[PDB]
Design a protein around this nucleic acid. Structure first.
Ligand SMILES: [Zn+2]
Length: 362
DNA sequence: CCAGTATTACTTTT
DNA sequence: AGTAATACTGGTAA
């Protein structure tokens, strides 16, 4: 008995005829802008203002990222094309060369290092609207409005700028509007109220928040394409902190890691994964989907759940709950978890030959 | 030319 | 409020 049996997915969002279809994808995660805005303030940030972000239990890892961070998304898109239809709602799975790969809060935490513990009690009530009423008249608050105030505010004993800085940070990196311009969508109301309490903001599980936000963009994306990738130059926006999604395929799949990833010199070993690796420079601003598909090749070495190294065990003990949470009943995902739980790997070989045929031959 | 990014215009919902 | 079209960036390769 070589293990409990793992069932094929009920369905897939995309047929394998779409695996070669390239798309432009629009991020909404302005890591580079925020840092430039912060560094170019006419009245600079004080030590306490600076160290608030550079020693933040979650956001200090934003500073371990490479300078001028630019997102690379065809790994994420390759994953998206392989999203399985499942019952669970708090985790996503992608079937690559017939191997299911999980994107859950544990994986969002191992790559980003953000706090992914349970929300504090009655966390929505946190804050008040007093801080924002002191700077923003009645109406919509757009992201450009928060940035503008920050660059103009005068530094002073009230740490109100830091609150504006934090609000700018949250709504530009964690929970980010899609629409821009004169009619940009209003920024997340929770972040507006949460930014009034700097203590609360230093400890909140912003990873869970970022993660739950990513889950909505994933669902919206899959809803939008309805199984067909069009032929358009018009980019599709996927807002939120997508760095974990950008790296998942590379952490899971050694063939991609060997061609497109390099270790980051002098990184600390207790940091999450995004601090300790970097994308290789390529011919383009990001990898082409063809490059990903070609390097996938015929590889069978793929991790379903990406295993932590020993140096990463204290990290996860600190940023993840031991509270595996409650989700909808999933006979298929349960049968995967049961087989992986016993040390056995999963591989639907018809799906593997389909993937190989759709990329390498057709 | 390209993928990532920023911006403006047109469509759908309400 | 949502999506599509357009244009800009900083490269590479022809
Ligand atoms: Zn780090």
């Amino acid at each position: 008995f070589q293990g409990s049996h793992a069932m094929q997915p009920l369905g897939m969002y995309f047929p394998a005829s779409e695996y070669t279809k390239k798309m432009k994808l629009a991020t909404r995660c302005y890591i580079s802008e925020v840092l430039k805005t912060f560094a170019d303030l006419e009245h600079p940030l004080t030590n306490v203002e600076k160290n608030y972000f550079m020693e933040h239990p979650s956001f200090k890892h934003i500073y371990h990222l490479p300078s001028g961070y630019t997102h690379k998304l065809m790994g994420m898109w390759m994953l998206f094309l392989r999203t399985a239809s499942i019952e669970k709602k708090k985790e996503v799975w992608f079937v690559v060369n017939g191997v299911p790969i999980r994107y859950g809060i544990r994986e969002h935490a191992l790559i980003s290092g953000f706090n992914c513990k349970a929300y504090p009690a009655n966390y929505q009530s946190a804050g008040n609207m007093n801080f924002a009423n002191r700077y923003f008249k009645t109406g919509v608050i757009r992201r450009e409005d928060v940035k503008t105030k920050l660059m103009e505010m005068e530094p002073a004993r009230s740490k109100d700028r830091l609150r504006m800085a934090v609000l700018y940070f949250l709504t530009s990196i964690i929970a980010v509007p899609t629409k821009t311009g004169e009619r940009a969508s209003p920024i997340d109301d929770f972040c507006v109220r949460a930014a009034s309490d700097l203590t609360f903001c230093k400890t909140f599980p912003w990873g869970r928040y970022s993660f739950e936000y990513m889950l909505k963009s994933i669902s919206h994306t899959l809803d939008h394409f309805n199984g067909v990738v069009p032929n358009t130059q018009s980019p599709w926006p996927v807002p939120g902190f997508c760095v974990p999604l950008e790296f998942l395929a590379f952490e899971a799949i050694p063939s991609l890691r060997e061609r497109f990833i390099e270790e980051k010199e002098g990184s600390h070993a207790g940091c999450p994964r995004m601090c300790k690796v970097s994308f290789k420079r390529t011919e383009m601003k990001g990898f082409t989907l063809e490059q990903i598909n070609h390097v996938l090749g015929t590889t069978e070495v793929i991790e379903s759940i990406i295993r932590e190294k020993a140096e990463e065990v204290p990290l996860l003990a600190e940023i993840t709950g031991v509270e595996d949470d409650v989700d909808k009943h999933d006979v298929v995902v349960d049968s995967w978890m049961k087989r992986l739980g016993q040390g056995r790997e999963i591989r639907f070989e018809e799906v593997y030959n389909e993937d190989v045929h759709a990329r390498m031959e057709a």
